[PDB]
C-alpha cells in the first residue's frame, strides 16, 4: 500500500513542480505564522483564564503542529523519496494524525460549547468553566490517541522501487485493517465533525430565531444575520478544506486511477487544502472571537 510515496512515473514538468512547491511552502508559512501569533497573544495578553481562550490555544497549538509537518512532505515530494529515516517517519506521521484530530475535535468542542450556551444556558454555568475546558482537551487528546499512538507503531520506512516510502504497516490481513483505518479516519475526522457542527450550530440558530422580544425586533434580526453568516462561513470553510482530500483517499482505495499530471497536481492540492483549514482557523476562531478581538 502506497502512502506518502506517490506513483509519479512520467517526471514532473517545470510549472507543476514549482506550483506544488509554492503550495506546501505558502500553507506552511501562513499556518505557522497565524497560529504562533494566536499563541503569542494568548500567552502575552489574554493569559488563558477563560474556557474560550483555553480552547483557542489548544486549537492554535494543534494547527501549528499540523503545518509543521509540511516541510517534511514538501521534501518528500521533491526527491520523490522519504529521506528522514525511520524515527522521523514515526514522529511526523504520529504528529500529523494526532493534530488533525486535535484540531478537528477542538473546533467541534467550540461548536458544542456555543450550542450549550444558547440551548442549555443553565447547564452552561457548569460546562463553560476553565476547569472543564482543560478536562475536555484531555478527553479529546485521549480520543485522538486511539489513532495517534497506533500509527507511531505502524509507521515505518520500507523500500519501494529503490525509493523510500514512509508508510503504515498493518496486521494480517492488511486489506482489512488498512481499509478500516481509512474508514475510521473518514468518519471521525470528517463525517462526525460535519454532523456535530451543523446540528449544534443549526439548533443554536433555531433557538435564537424563536425568541420574540416585545420591543427591538430590528436588533434581533441584525444579530441573527451576523451569527447565521458566521455559522455558514465556519461550516463552509471546514467542508471546502477537508472534503476533497477525504473523498480522494476513499476513491484511491476503491479504484485505480491513471497517473497523469492533473491527478498528481490535484492530489497535492487536496492535501494542501486540508492544511489550509489550520491556516483559516486562527481567523475564524481567534481573531474573530468577541473577547480575543478586543485584546488584539
Amino acid at each position, epitope marked *: 500500500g502506497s502512502h506518502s510515496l506517490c506513483p509519479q512515473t512520467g517526471s514532473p514538468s517545470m510549472v507543476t513542480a514549482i506550483t506544488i512547491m509554492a503550495l506546501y511552502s505558502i500553507v506552511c508559512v501562513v499556518g505557522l505564522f497565524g497560529n504562533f501569533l494566536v499563541m503569542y497573544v494568548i500567552v502575552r495578553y489574554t*493569559k488563558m*483564564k*477563560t474556557a*474560550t481562550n483555553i480552547y483557542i490555544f489548544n486549537l492554535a497549538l494543534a494547527d501549528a503542529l499540523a503545518t509543521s509537518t509540511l516541510p517534511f512532505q514538501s521534501v518528500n515530494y521533491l526527491m520523490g523519496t522519504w529521506p528522514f529515516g525511520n524515527i522521523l517517519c514515526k514522529i511526523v506521521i504520529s504528529i500529523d494524525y494526532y493534530n488533525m484530530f486535535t484540531s478537528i475535535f477542538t473546533l467541534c468542542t467550540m461548536s458544542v460549547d*456555543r450550542y450549550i*450556551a*444558547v440551548c442549555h*444556558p*443553565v447547564k*452552561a*454555568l*457548569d460546562f*463553560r*468553566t*476553565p476547569r472543564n475546558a482543560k478536562i475536555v482537551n484531555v478527553c479529546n487528546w485521549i480520543l485522538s490517541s486511539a489513532i495517534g499512538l497506533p500509527v507511531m507503531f505502524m509507521a515505518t520506512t520500507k523500500y519501494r522501487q529503490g525509493s523510500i516510502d514512509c508508510t503504515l504497516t498493518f496486521s494480517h490481513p492488511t486489506w482489512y485493517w488498512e481499509n478500516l483505518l481509512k474508514i475510521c479516519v473518514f468518519i471521525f475526522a470528517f463525517i462526525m465533525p460535519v454532523l456535530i457542527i451543523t446540528v449544534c450550530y443549526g439548533l*443554536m440558530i433555531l*433557538r*435564537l430565531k*424563536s*425568541v*420574540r*422580544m*416585545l*420591543s*427591538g425586533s430590528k*436588533e*434581533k434580526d441584525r*444579530n441573527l444575520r451576523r*451569527i447565521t453568516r458566521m455559522v455558514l462561513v465556519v461550516v463552509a470553510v471546514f467542508i471546502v478544506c477537508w472534503t476533497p482530500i477525504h473523498i480522494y483517499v476513499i476513491i484511491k482505495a476503491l479504484i485505480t486511477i491513471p497517473e497523469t499530471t492533473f491527478q498528481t497536481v490535484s492530489w497535492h492540492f487536496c492535501i494542501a487544502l486540508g492544511y489550509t483549514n489550520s491556516c483559516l482557523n486562527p481567523v475564524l476562531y481567534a481573531f474573530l*472571537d*468577541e*473577547n480575543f478581538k478586543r485584546c488584539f
Partner: nanobody
Amino acid sequence: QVQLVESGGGLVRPGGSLRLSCVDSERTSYPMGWFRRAPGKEREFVASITWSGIDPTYADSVADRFTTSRDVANNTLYLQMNSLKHEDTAVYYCAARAPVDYDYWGQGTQVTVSS
C-alpha cells in the same frame, strides 16, 4: 418602567457557591451585565454576556471562578459564583440594556462571604 428582579444572593461560607439570577419578565430590557460594589470600594465590573448568550466577558479577578449565561428564551441572566472569597463580599447589581454602558440597574443583592 423597567423592574429588574435579582435573586440568589445571601450568606455563604468561604469556598462556597452562589447562583444569581436576574429577569425582566416584561421583555422591556435585556439583563446582560453584572456589577458589584464592595463596602469601601468603587463600583466594579464583574461579568457580562452578549444578547445571544454566546460570548461572556469576565473581569480578571473572577474569570477563574465565575460563569455567566443568558436564557434568550425567557430573558434571564445568570451568574454562577464558585470558590467565593472575602473579596467577593459586595452588593451585586444586575444591569440591562434597552432594545433600542447600561440603561437600567437593579437595586442590588447583598452577597456576604463569612465563616
